[PDB]
Amino acid sequence: QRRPQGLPNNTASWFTALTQHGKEDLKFPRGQGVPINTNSSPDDQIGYYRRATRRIRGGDGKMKDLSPRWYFYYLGTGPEAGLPYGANKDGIIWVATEGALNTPKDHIGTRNPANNAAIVLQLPQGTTLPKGFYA
């Protein structure tokens, strides 16, 4: 009758991931890399990508890494919500559109996948990507 339910996951990226197909980490030149979000202000255009690598058990019973995925989070949100903009950390890269305000984006926050689908991550036409990334 009463089907169990856990605490909600409220911490997902609003956007789909950028999959790393090659050997190069994600990186963006200064001023590039913030995904398109038409429901945001110029003040809002700042955050980080965080690498996540999924592992699966192969046929041999041994663990294999899949292609790394890089997920975008607005500044002050997500798994590294505490970090100030530009805090270097392995697996983190920082991006900001010129004019963004260096303040946490609590008014955007993160996504509950049970309630909202991810937005396809789109970048402005002309954005530079490293080899191994496509958008």
Numbering used by the authors: 39 to 173
Task: Give me lines lifted from the publication on this model.
While the S, M, and E proteins mainly contribute to the outer shell structure of the virus particle, the N protein forms the viral capsid by packaging the viral RNA genome into a helical ribonucleoprotein (RNP) complex. The SARS-CoV-2 N protein consists of 419 amino acids and comprises two structural domains: the N-terminal domain (N-NTD; residues 49–174) and the C-terminal domain (N-CTD; residues 247–364). These two domains are connected by a highly flexible linker region (residues 175–246), and at either end of these domains are intrinsically disordered regions, namely the N-arm (at the N-terminus; residues 1–48) and the C-tail (at the C-terminus; residues 365–419). While the N protein interacts with RNA through the N-NTD, the N-CTD is involved in the self-dimerization of full-length N protein and RNA binding.
Our crystallization efforts resulted in a high-resolution (1.55 Å) structure of the N-NTD with a small part of the N-arm in complex with ssDNA. The crystallization of only the N-terminal part of the full-length N protein, after an extended period, led us to hypothesize that the full-length N protein might have been digested in the crystallization condition, with only the N-terminal part crystallizing under the given condition. Overall, we solved the crystal structure of the N protein from residues 39 to 173, covering part of the flexible N-arm and the entire N-NTD. The N-NTD resembles a right-handed fist, containing a core of four-stranded antiparallel ß-sheets (ß1-ß5-ß2-ß6), which is sandwiched between two loops, a short 310 helix (η), and a protruding ß-hairpin (ß3 and ß4) between ß2 and ß5. Our crystal structure revealed that the N-NTD, along with part of the flexible N-arm, arranges in a specific pattern where the N-arm extends to neighboring molecules and anchors between two molecules through significant hydrogen bonding. In our structure, we were able to model a small segment (TTT) of the T-20 ssDNA based on well-defined electron density. The Watson–Crick face of ssDNA interacts with the protein through direct and water-mediated hydrogen bonds as well as π–π stacking. The 2-carbonyl group forms a hydrogen bond with the mainchain amino proton of S51, the N3 atom forms a hydrogen bond with the sidechain –OH group of Y111, and the 4-carbonyl group forms a water-mediated hydrogen bond with the guanidino group of R88. T0 also stacks with Y109 through π–π stacking. Residues R88, Y111, Y109, and R149 are involved in interactions with both DNA and RNA.
